[PDB]
Amino acid sequence: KSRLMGLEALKSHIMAAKAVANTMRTSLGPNGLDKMMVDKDGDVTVTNDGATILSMMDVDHQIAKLMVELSKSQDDEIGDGTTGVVVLAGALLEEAEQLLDRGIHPIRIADGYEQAARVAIEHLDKISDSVLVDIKDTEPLIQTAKTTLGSKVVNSCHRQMAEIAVNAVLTVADMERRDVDFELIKVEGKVGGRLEDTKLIKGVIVDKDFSHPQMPKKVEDAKIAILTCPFEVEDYKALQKYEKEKFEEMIQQIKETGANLAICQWGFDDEANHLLLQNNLPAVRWVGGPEIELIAIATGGRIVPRFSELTAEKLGFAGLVQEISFGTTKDKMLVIEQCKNSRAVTIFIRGGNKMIIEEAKRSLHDALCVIRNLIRDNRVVYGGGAAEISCALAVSQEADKCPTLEQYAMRAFADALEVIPMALSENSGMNPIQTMTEVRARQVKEMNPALGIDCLHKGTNDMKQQHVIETLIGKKQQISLATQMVRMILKIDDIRKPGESEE
Amino acid sequence: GTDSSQGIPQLVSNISACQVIAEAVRTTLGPRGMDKLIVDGRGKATISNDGATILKLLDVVHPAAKTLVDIAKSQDAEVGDGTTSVTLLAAEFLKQVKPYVEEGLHPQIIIRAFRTATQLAVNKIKEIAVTVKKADKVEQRKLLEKCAMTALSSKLISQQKAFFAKMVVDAVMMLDDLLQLKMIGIKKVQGGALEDSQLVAGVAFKKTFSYAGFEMQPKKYHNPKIALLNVELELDYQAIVDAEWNILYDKLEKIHHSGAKVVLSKLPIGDVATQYFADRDMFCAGRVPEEDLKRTMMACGGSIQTSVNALSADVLGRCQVFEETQIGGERYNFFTGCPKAKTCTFILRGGAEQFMEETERSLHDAIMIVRRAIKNDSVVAGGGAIEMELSKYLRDYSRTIPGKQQLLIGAYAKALEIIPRQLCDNAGFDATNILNKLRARHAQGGTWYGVDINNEDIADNFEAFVWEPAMVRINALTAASEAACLIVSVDETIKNPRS
Amino acid sequence: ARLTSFIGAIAIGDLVKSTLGPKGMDKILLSSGRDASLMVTNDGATILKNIGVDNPAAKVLVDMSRVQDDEVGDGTTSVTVLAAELLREAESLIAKKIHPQTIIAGWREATKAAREALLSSAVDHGSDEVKFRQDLMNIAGTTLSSKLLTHHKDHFTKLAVEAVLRLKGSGNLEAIHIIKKLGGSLADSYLDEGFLLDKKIGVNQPKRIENAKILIANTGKVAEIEHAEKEKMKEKVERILKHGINCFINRQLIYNYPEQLFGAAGVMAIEHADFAGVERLALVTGGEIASTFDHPELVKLGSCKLIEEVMIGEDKLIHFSGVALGEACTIVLRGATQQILDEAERSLHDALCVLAQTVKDSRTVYGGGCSEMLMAHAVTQLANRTPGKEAVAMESYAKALRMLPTIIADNAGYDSADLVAQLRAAHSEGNTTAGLDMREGTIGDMAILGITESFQVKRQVLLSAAEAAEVILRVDNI
Amino acid sequence: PAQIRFSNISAAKAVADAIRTSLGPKGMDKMIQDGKGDVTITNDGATILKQMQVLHPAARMLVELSKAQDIEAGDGTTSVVIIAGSLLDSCTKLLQKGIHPTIISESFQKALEKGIEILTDMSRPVELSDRETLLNSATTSLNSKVVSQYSSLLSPMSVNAVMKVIDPATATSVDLRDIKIVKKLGGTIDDCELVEGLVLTQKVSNSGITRVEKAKIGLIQFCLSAPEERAYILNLVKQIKKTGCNVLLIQKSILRDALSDLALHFLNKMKIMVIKDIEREDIEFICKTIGTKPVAHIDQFTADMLGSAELAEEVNLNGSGKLLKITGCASPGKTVTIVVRGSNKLVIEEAERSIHDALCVIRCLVKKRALIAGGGAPEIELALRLTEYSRTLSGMESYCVRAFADAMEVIPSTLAENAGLNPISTVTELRNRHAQGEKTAGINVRKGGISNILEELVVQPLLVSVSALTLATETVRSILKIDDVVNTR
């Protein structure tokens, strides 16, 4: 019958896996053709980030399942440019098949790609003309956030948006440990709004209802609760005695304890809250669960849903006195901003488009990696393919003073990196061969390594004046976690598929 | 369409069945063997380079394949690694004895020839066995560190593998009670350089939401021990709330009364209720792995509990010290300091994530190599030098014996030669030159010229301290011969179905 | 059946499309499997000649290219490509439900504007104004496109510039003459005064003759009347000694008893040359053609003054010099292959034909396709003016005029979607002197770089292409 | 356009890789039973290509390449096919990458001239005064044969044939044209001689004298015709009696009776040479030898048709071979003399064939007066230098010249493959040894090992490699430019 095995297995997986890369190699670059996302249920959206593309796609071959598994293990590392790992995966796999045509064993191709990567990262450190003083760099951080927004008209509000980004990385700037944690989630995206109404609020505005629907909302006092207290005619008369009891024992236990804006998560009757309103104190019914940390950090406290543990130093906490109409046509939401600073900080987005919500959360997280890589390791590389051409030239140069057959891996390596400026030039609607080799000749005649591919269609190929800037951690992680998986695919030969009844 | 159930078709079907299951584990031989990927069928991707880890998770439908995979199962119960070598050797025995069967030679004759050749080989391995014990291996232990160096020699890891070699000889020497893979775990730590790794004297576990409660626990404590509980800790309509409040009260009071420092369970503890179960007044832990369950009871000694106010004698009994430290930034569990310390866990502090695979391929046999070089001293070389010496001896024994066994013992000889031939093919070199240049100076110069895995040229593995245990090779080729003669002795497979 | 006419004509225009321009790539004229072995050719004119054309509507386009062939030489490929592009444009207008007669009328009034807009940029060169040389060497070189003979290209322009003093009566293309042998290269051509046939009496026949009055011979109880016919042909050889001639054309075959008896009477009998050279023998030397020669007795012969026959360097290198009208400036190369035989003759005919058009009328327009863009912009401006459906029929007439400098850029290997469109945009304001340079592949001043083309081939292309279009468009059935 | 260009690529690569294994002296012989009874046991691929049933035109161009290489240099006949097939194969990546074929063509021309100038100065010049390097090239060429014992018998003879007439043809280089050749059955091999003038091997037996100092030559091709034509035979021999010729050759072009006894007795009464059916290709060079005019017309005989001679004898050379040796003509002796005498048949064909190979190698040593170390070394050298040149090069050419480089490496690897070595590793170590050592490092197929071949003495004249590279690049260029076929003339 049939049984696919041997080196023909390695031929079949590569043309499988690079086919996935052939899906993603048109999404590289900010001028890359961004791409829909249609569920089996029937939902429809658009996305440009390749990580969402590979994650929410459902593949059939196990090599592609491995690919999306490992590239989701790159999203925590970088999250930006995870497309290029798949593109380099397809490129190195194609060149490895080209070496397999001449009979080289794929183990030798794999560790030759490893030696070429050990040329690559170190030469990337050699061409690292980074500016390391990028700490109080509020003026070049406009250009840092500029290329992240460059595919849209968000640059026209980057005087708002990029300054939101620089204030965001200012507020999260733990100057010694240098990380966004699980508490510092920087998103409040109001679906509906405009370009500038994505603006500066370091506070909590969630869609929960009021204490009273005509209550004076001015609760300046930090004396604010959060309750773990649920609802858990002699039946209703005993329950009403429990209700006025719950008043004169829960609220009087509060008067012993200090948990005043009783935002209950469960059932309640608001006439007790109305009698609190006649005594001039608020209490909200049926509020949401996991927002206790986000509310409570607004002066510096943490999660306090308890009856008794919410004391005068661990109250429900509030940010900054401002009173704007949250729901204009919507119900006006909670003013949880009165008092002090929020470390686990969260910004006001009023983006009406799901694209501008998706980019302003995840490109802000990518800032939170690369402006983390302006504090954690302040090493930037001028991108736009210039890093790849500068790296590939030295990989080909180190493929000269080495005596082994492994040499043919490194020449197969460098050309594979040439798919990165090619797909930048192909998606930007130019000649992919001639532009990249002209930039390569301009680099071999002029030793500036910041000559790349004009993706923005600006003046020249010099990435200094246009500031197409990646970080060296984002480049090194990309190349190393492309090599560490090209070796993984090349080390795997026989997919004896279970349940696929081998006759 | 091919029907094969008569006697010569029976044996031909049996040896094709062993050849296919040998090809199913052919590439995995050696330290740098090719990985094989299988699934469960539902999406549980398993990439393996081990043999029995492949073979158990593999399917097996054939009778003769099933009656060799039992020998394969028997070989992993000794040390683990080596199950591919015995199966590949027995399959090459069958493939080399193949053309003699259909030409008209009897299976009992070739079985007896296999047995006599095996007795000759197990004789000749004993005389060339060399002990290396009192050449400074436990006192002035550095030469036993030198074979600890044989895991990752002359690499960029080798500078850190100096520390890894010192710590693997410590991970063997401090705990030698016929040590196992269970008593020494490795723990991956992201971030940092590979030189910053460690070997702790105790357990080490990352804490998650369902794992463990709250920091600032009694670390520097004289006798910190464990409650090992199997009940949860977490939180008519007027008669169901007060009972839960009272249960919250008595489970709070259990921590004061029993005096447990850290309660352990296979049940979730709330880290969204972090201070709320710091309002248990002490540390706790939940959702426990079995290695934590052993290595804090068989080594530390934390007692097991049953009820509402379950007190015991070993919830604050004799262990040395507690620790909870940002190892690589993330705070980990440490019930370290075990009074019955067959527990020293490796702490892989390093940057890249897939170096866990590198260490669990390269230091998971280095523990085996070092603890075997302590366990066995009568050792021989590796790299297929030993099979080559036995092949030379039996190539002589074939032509120096009259009778029909002469063609069979030589068939016993050349069938050894795929052991390095599969090795270099897993390395990448040409098998033909690396075998001919091996055999020339092997038949002229000396014995222990072997196949080097790094530069792919014939070297002296006895001088590179590549020690293979003599008893392990004895059991290996004994099992290879036994699984050979079992399939050769099999002719008929009677089915007798249901219907 | 109107669609398959368009298909048959578009296929013929495609089979000269990749040979358009002097970067054209060669096709294979494989044929009937007896001895078809190979034929590579950049010349698209001989491609359609060796095409066995099946559709009869495509035969009309083939013969329109044949009308273009004998007119000026090269220009068949441009006319065929432009006409097939006009038909590919017109079938898109037919599917939008426009009547073909309106498209024909639009072709006509568009071709009128495209004809006069060539005259708006009618630049005349200084070879017929101030007696320059290189300006006409440019058109003599670009008519030698897709060829090799660039070494003695200056000899070709010498035969051009000696024509305006010696070989024009009205731009005479009968005083030109080309022959060659094999063995050697481009560097073998020189000035000769006729054909290559030798003295034939042998080692005794001397070189210089006195006066060659020259015409055609006839030839050279049953056996006795056979001897009487021998006596009559012997009467003829007595009647030719009293002439006094020194050469003669021998159009019919002759053995040694007529031959030696001719040459002993001083008659050099030239055995049956090709009649095209005998045309130059007829008046340029001055010796006519007949069948009988009984009645020319002293007066009705040919008239010339000197004919000499030398033997230089492995050829029959006869230099027929000293003729009465010394105009038969003959090229004798010694080429490489058999292909250069027809190639040098037909290419000098193509070159010196439009060079004779310049010595008639030396106006020229810049080549490289910028004249096509000028006619395209001129008919596009008239398309924006007139109402009716015919304003659509002008626009597609623009589009084929965009495709003619496109294909020249396309067979150059370069991109053609950008800088042809850049040339179209730049031609609207950066006026007519700009254009496409194919050799360096850019946009440059064609008047500075001198890539010109004769007006008497551009008008003949642009008129006859629409003339071929209006014929086959008006045909619908069979 | 692309779908037919790819078909040309595939057909030419198929016709090139069908003979790619036969490269080198260790190239294995073939056996294909295609045609109508063809047995093709031969290790040389030229006669393999001459019997190939070729239908595709681009595949036929590579067969034309073999005969072009045979005419130009005679050596490297399979190499001009294998290099062309590798270049057309490497053009597929350039086609699928996006480069138009005209750019590929001109970049291949640039790499061709760069490779030619890199090859021609990395060589060693040999001189016409040096006759020892002619014996060196003979030991590379005339030996390793069955004329290995006839190499001392044959090589200095042709060397002295050039030393006699160092002829002014193609910059005073060796033509096919020293002093006329013959070949004769019977006798022994050492009965070869360097003649001086025209020799006939055909049989004349005149009891009358044919041995005259001032012997005349008449080139009468007119044989006898039957009737009247008897009186015409009489009249012809009256003209021959008026001639006085004694060494006239006589052809059978008109009819088959050439000198019957009416004419034959009247021509042994004046005792003429009678040799019939002169071999037709050597007739015109006999005309270029003597000076008598190629005239079958019996009445166009003149006194200047008196062909001149000094000594013409029907002499039994080497004891018993009655041959007609003539000296003292106007230009006596056209081609290149090796009188291949020998009793066996293999010493008749193989001595002549090896002398033709010696002719093609001595004309190769003076058309271009240099010589390189053969055996895969200059291909590796060009693959290194053109890779550096393409690294310095700009534009879309920078890959194609690089694609010109890698396709140059098929000649050593096949030489590594045919010699039993592992090809890719041996090519890698050959490149690494050459990059830090010398040019002359190659693959000694005569001993089977990678070494310095200038020590191991397998060298070749430079014009073989330059002509093979130029012819292969030109055919690759043309087949790249071929983009359309059309049938039915």
Side-chain angles (χ1 to χ4, degrees), chain A residues 122-345:
Chain A
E122 282 71 354
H123 177 72
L124 177 84
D125 307 321
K126 287 305 189 57
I127 64 187
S128 170
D129 50 346
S130 168
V131 44
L132 268 286
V133 70
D134 287 341
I135 293 95
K136 213 58 68 188
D137 55 318
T138 64
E139 312 91 358
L141 273 163
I142 291 291
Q143 297 157 337
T144 311
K146 174 173 167 63
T147 60
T148 56
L149 310 173
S151 159
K152 270 78 67 178
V153 195
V154 188
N155 314 310
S156 313
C157 47
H158 89 296
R159 82 283 189 272
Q160 188 66 240
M161 181 48 221
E163 284 176 11
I164 283 154
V166 72
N167 295 303
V169 297
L170 186 132
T171 42
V172 305
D174 42 351
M175 312 289 189
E176 315 91 350
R177 287 326 297 127
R178 295 170 166 97
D179 167 71
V180 49
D181 208 74
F182 323 105
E183 75 255 10
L184 288 96
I185 172 66
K186 196 73 170 148
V187 56
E188 269 178 348
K190 264 78 187 181
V191 181
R194 52 194 175 90
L195 73 164
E196 197 272 330
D197 267 347
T198 72
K199 54 201 178 302
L200 186 67
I201 291 182
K202 313 298 209 176
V204 196
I205 297 103
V206 77
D207 306 1
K208 282 306 154 163
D209 52 339
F210 271 128
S211 293
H212 169 244
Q214 285 90 0
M215 186 204 52
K217 302 160 278 297
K218 198 49 172 57
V219 192
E220 197 268 347
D221 205 351
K223 289 286 181 177
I224 286 159
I226 171 64
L227 308 187
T228 179
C229 189
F231 201 77
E232 185 252 354
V233 294
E234 289 177 19
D235 279 3
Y236 178 67
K237 251 173 188 166
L239 206 45
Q240 182 80 15
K241 262 204 181 307
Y242 185 78
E243 207 273 333
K244 205 182 176 178
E245 188 263 348
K246 175 173 169 67
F247 202 101
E248 295 299 329
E249 64 89 14
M250 299 305 202
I251 312 294
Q252 283 277 0
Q253 180 70 252
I254 279 153
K255 282 182 178 297
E256 196 267 301
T257 311
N260 306 75
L261 171 41
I263 49 172
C264 166
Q265 309 186 0
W266 296 281
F268 180 65
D269 193 17
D270 205 63
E271 311 288 338
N273 179 50
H274 192 254
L275 262 298
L276 293 168
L277 176 136
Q278 306 294 143
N279 272 118
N280 317 303
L281 68 155
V284 188
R285 179 187 193 256
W286 265 103
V287 305
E291 313 157 2
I292 311 165
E293 290 92 341
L294 174 62
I295 287 169
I297 209 62
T299 80
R302 287 291 177 89
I303 168 164
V304 282
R306 187 53 191 168
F307 303 98
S308 299
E309 208 46 61
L310 196 148
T311 50
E313 69 270 14
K314 287 189 77 55
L315 297 150
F317 278 142
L320 173 144
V321 285
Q322 65 92 32
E323 303 88 5
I324 61 178
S325 178
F326 302 148
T328 60
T329 175
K330 159 69 191 43
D331 161 72
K332 150 91 172 174
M333 283 154 269
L334 305 181
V335 195
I336 316 170
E337 54 281 359
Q338 276 87 9
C339 307
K340 268 165 286 309
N341 200 12
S342 305
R343 167 66 204 186
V345 75

Side-chain angles (χ1 to χ4, degrees), chain D residues 213-390:
Chain D
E213 197 265 354
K214 199 40 81 170
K216 293 180 179 181
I217 314 295
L219 209 158
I220 288 297
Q221 315 160 7
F222 185 73
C223 80
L224 302 203
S225 190
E228 300 174 12
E229 298 301 316
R230 167 200 296 170
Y232 200 73
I233 284 153
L234 286 145
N235 194 4
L236 169 55
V237 189
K238 297 302 185 294
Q239 301 163 15
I240 303 170
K241 178 59 66 153
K242 289 182 306 195
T243 300
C245 199
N246 59 316
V247 201
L248 66 99
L249 71 158
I250 174 65
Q251 203 182 355
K252 294 203 197 89
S253 280
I254 305 295
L255 278 190
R256 312 286 88 80
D257 212 317
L259 217 67
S260 88
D261 303 336
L262 174 67
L264 179 55
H265 178 262
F266 298 162
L267 289 179
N268 49 63
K269 94 187 163 184
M270 65 180 294
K271 310 155 297 296
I272 74 156
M273 179 263 287
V274 179
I275 284 172
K276 279 86 61 180
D277 281 327
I278 313 103
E279 58 280 6
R280 307 298 150 108
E281 64 287 340
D282 194 31
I283 285 177
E284 52 94 18
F285 280 155
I286 280 170
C287 313
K288 287 184 47 184
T289 291
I290 305 171
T292 175
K293 312 283 187 177
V295 176
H297 304 338
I298 77 169
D299 48 25
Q300 201 56 38
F301 154 71
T302 188
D304 303 346
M305 287 200 48
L306 268 48
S308 315
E310 207 275 332
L311 64 89
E313 306 88 343
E314 44 180 340
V315 52
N316 272 317
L317 289 204
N318 319 104
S320 316
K322 42 185 204 82
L323 64 89
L324 192 72
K325 197 256 168 182
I326 300 103
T327 201
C329 310
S331 58
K334 290 289 105 174
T335 167
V336 185
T337 301
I338 284 297
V339 185
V340 184
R341 198 182 274 271
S343 42
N344 197 289
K345 188 44 77 183
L346 66 93
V347 307
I348 284 169
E349 48 93 18
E350 185 59 36
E352 192 189 16
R353 184 52 246 170
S354 46
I355 280 305
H356 209 82
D357 308 319
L359 194 155
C360 297
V361 75
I362 62 179
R363 72 190 180 88
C364 189
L365 279 156
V366 63
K367 213 158 163 289
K368 184 56 196 160
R369 298 178 188 173
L371 180 142
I372 46 170
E379 289 83 3
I380 286 298
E381 198 265 346
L382 287 187
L384 196 59
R385 299 311 162 195
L386 286 162
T387 311
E388 307 147 0
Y389 190 52
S390 53

Side-chain angles (χ1 to χ4, degrees), chain C residues 15 18 25-31 37-38 40 50-52 201 203 256 259 410-413, chain D residues 57 60-61 64 100 102-103 293 297 299-300 302 304 478 481-489:
Chain C
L15 288 199
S18 43
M25 45 207 69
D26 50 342
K27 314 192 161 82
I28 302 301
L29 303 186
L30 198 79
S31 67
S37 45
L38 203 44
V40 282
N50 304 353
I51 279 170
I201 301 304
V203 289
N256 288 303
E259 186 260 356
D410 269 314
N411 300 131
Chain D
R60 196 187 167 275
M61 302 211 59
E64 300 153 11
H100 200 277
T102 77
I103 292 97
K293 312 283 187 177
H297 304 338
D299 48 25
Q300 201 56 38
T302 188
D304 303 346
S478 196
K481 269 151 163 307
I482 282 162
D483 267 344
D484 278 311
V485 73
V486 48
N487 280 329
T488 76
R489 174 168 305 126

Side-chain angles (χ1 to χ4, degrees), chain C residues 127-301:
Chain C
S127 312
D128 279 311
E129 288 173 319
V130 302
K131 278 301 179 187
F132 275 170
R133 302 286 94 98
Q134 52 92 33
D135 44 355
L136 265 284
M137 287 198 67
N138 306 139
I139 182 52
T142 181
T143 53
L144 213 65
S145 303
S146 67
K147 289 154 208 166
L148 298 174
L149 269 296
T150 176
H151 170 94
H152 279 330
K153 185 248 160 166
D154 43 21
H155 189 72
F156 304 155
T157 65
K158 171 247 173 198
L159 264 73
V161 71
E162 79 179 331
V164 70
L165 282 70
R166 184 153 34 160
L167 296 77
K168 72 164 188 62
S170 315
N172 180 41
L173 289 176
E174 295 292 318
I176 49 170
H177 198 175
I178 303 100
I179 204 170
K180 67 183 68 61
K181 210 185 160 67
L182 273 75
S185 89
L186 278 63
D188 292 337
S189 160
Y190 74 110
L191 163 72
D192 184 358
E193 211 162 335
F195 203 62
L196 293 198
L197 267 163
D198 212 12
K199 315 148 299 292
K200 289 176 186 177
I201 301 304
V203 289
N204 46 357
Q205 203 163 8
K207 304 288 175 171
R208 181 205 158 86
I209 81 184
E210 172 72 22
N211 272 309
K213 311 302 193 266
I214 171 155
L215 294 184
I216 309 283
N218 195 20
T219 175
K221 55 187 81 55
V222 292
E224 201 45 77
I225 296 301
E226 180 60 41
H227 309 333
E229 290 164 359
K230 286 153 180 155
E231 196 269 331
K232 183 58 69 178
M233 59 78 58
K234 198 179 182 296
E235 177 57 47
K236 260 73 172 179
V237 309
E238 299 148 21
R239 285 166 62 153
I240 70 181
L241 177 50
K242 62 99 175 181
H243 283 303
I245 74 173
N246 288 87
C247 279
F248 212 58
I249 299 302
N250 185 28
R251 207 171 38 83
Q252 305 194 24
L253 305 177
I254 283 300
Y255 74 106
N256 288 303
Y257 176 72
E259 186 260 356
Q260 174 52 76
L261 195 38
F262 295 155
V267 189
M268 173 54 230
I270 297 177
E271 183 64 44
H272 196 72
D274 180 76
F275 201 73
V278 185
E279 291 159 349
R280 298 129 178 86
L281 296 169
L283 77 169
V284 185
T285 77
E288 296 92 5
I289 304 107
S291 90
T292 183
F293 70 113
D294 187 78
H295 74 87
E297 279 291 277
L298 217 48
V299 55
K300 294 176 256 166
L301 280 180

Side-chain angles (χ1 to χ4, degrees), chain B residues 268-378:
Chain B
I269 315 295
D271 283 27
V272 296
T274 291
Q275 73 100 24
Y276 194 94
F277 289 86
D279 286 322
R280 292 296 167 196
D281 206 75
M282 284 303 299
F283 197 29
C284 175
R287 290 304 185 188
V288 59
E290 317 304 292
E291 213 53 56
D292 202 11
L293 283 163
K294 298 301 168 300
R295 291 173 102 196
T296 53
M297 179 47 188
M298 71 93 61
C300 209
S303 41
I304 308 177
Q305 287 73 27
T306 175
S307 309
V308 165
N309 202 353
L311 193 144
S312 82
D314 287 317
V315 299
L316 212 43
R318 277 86 55 201
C319 287
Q320 265 76 15
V321 80
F322 182 75
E323 185 212 350
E324 201 254 341
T325 42
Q326 317 181 321
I327 302 305
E330 175 54 55
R331 282 163 186 171
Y332 301 152
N333 181 16
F334 307 94
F335 309 133
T336 50
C338 285
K340 310 166 274 301
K342 229 169 164 179
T343 294
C344 297
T345 318
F346 192 78
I347 316 296
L348 200 171
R349 289 196 287 269
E353 185 258 349
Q354 290 302 315
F355 277 150
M356 167 86 164
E357 177 84 28
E358 180 93 20
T359 305
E360 198 46 35
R361 183 60 176 187
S362 58
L363 291 195
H364 190 77
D365 47 347
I367 44 183
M368 165 174 173
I369 279 173
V370 169
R371 92 157 168 268
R372 185 74 257 180
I374 273 184
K375 263 167 210 196
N376 183 23
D377 317 316
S378 45

Side-chain angles (χ1 to χ4, degrees), chain B residues 61-326:
Chain B
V61 301
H62 213 275
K66 198 64 198 312
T67 40
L68 63 100
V69 78
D70 46 9
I71 316 294
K73 286 171 204 169
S74 70
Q75 291 330 287
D76 192 288
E78 324 298 313
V79 284
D81 166 69
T83 59
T84 83
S85 44
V86 51
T87 48
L88 265 50
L89 187 50
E92 200 39 65
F93 276 135
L94 265 63
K95 206 177 81 200
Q96 280 323 292
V97 80
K98 167 63 168 292
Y100 294 133
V101 190
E102 68 261 7
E103 87 189 27
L105 270 304
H106 197 271
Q108 293 286 147
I109 299 181
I110 74 195
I111 277 162
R112 178 206 285 103
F114 272 29
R115 191 186 322 274
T116 319
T118 314
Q119 291 178 357
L120 284 179
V122 76
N123 285 312
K124 298 300 265 295
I125 188 52
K126 278 189 296 293
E127 288 91 50
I128 57 189
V130 177
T131 182
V132 286
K133 183 50 160 190
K134 262 311 162 189
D136 279 342
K137 299 293 189 173
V138 63
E139 53 90 19
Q140 192 58 252
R141 55 168 181 156
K142 53 161 199 303
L143 300 96
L144 195 133
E145 300 187 309
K146 179 68 173 66
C147 54
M149 275 187 256
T150 52
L152 287 165
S153 317
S154 55
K155 289 158 185 163
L156 60 89
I157 310 169
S158 198
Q159 293 86 3
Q160 308 90 326
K161 190 259 303 175
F163 169 77
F164 297 153
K166 189 166 303 154
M167 286 333 277
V168 74
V169 175
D170 294 338
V172 170
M173 276 188 328
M174 296 154 39
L175 305 89
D176 266 329
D177 314 304
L178 309 96
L179 267 163
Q180 298 89 16
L181 312 175
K182 300 169 68 175
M183 302 301 123
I184 308 295
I186 71 149
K187 293 287 110 175
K188 172 60 135 177
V189 181
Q190 293 286 92
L194 319 171
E195 204 265 350
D196 317 313
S197 195
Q198 201 264 331
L199 174 81
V200 74
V203 310
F205 288 99
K206 194 256 177 210
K207 58 176 209 71
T208 68
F209 160 72
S210 313
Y211 210 70
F214 172 63
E215 305 95 357
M216 303 300 168
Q217 320 101 329
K219 290 159 276 301
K220 187 56 186 67
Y221 193 73
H222 61 95
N223 276 330
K225 257 205 193 180
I226 294 309
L228 197 154
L229 176 56
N230 319 125
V231 192
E232 52 97 22
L233 204 52
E234 301 306 291
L235 181 133
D236 188 8
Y237 195 71
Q238 87 291 330
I240 207 66
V241 198
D242 64 340
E244 173 64 35
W245 206 276
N246 179 82
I247 283 298
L248 285 172
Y249 199 53
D250 54 59
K251 294 319 168 305
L252 191 150
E253 282 318 308
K254 181 200 191 143
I255 323 291
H256 303 157
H257 176 265
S258 310
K261 185 215 174 307
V262 195
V263 173
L264 265 287
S265 90
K266 332 167 294 305
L267 297 100
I269 315 295
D271 283 27
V272 296
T274 291
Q275 73 100 24
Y276 194 94
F277 289 86
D279 286 322
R280 292 296 167 196
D281 206 75
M282 284 303 299
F283 197 29
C284 175
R287 290 304 185 188
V288 59
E290 317 304 292
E291 213 53 56
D292 202 11
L293 283 163
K294 298 301 168 300
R295 291 173 102 196
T296 53
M297 179 47 188
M298 71 93 61
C300 209
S303 41
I304 308 177
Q305 287 73 27
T306 175
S307 309
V308 165
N309 202 353
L311 193 144
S312 82
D314 287 317
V315 299
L316 212 43
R318 277 86 55 201
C319 287
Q320 265 76 15
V321 80
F322 182 75
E323 185 212 350
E324 201 254 341
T325 42
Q326 317 181 321

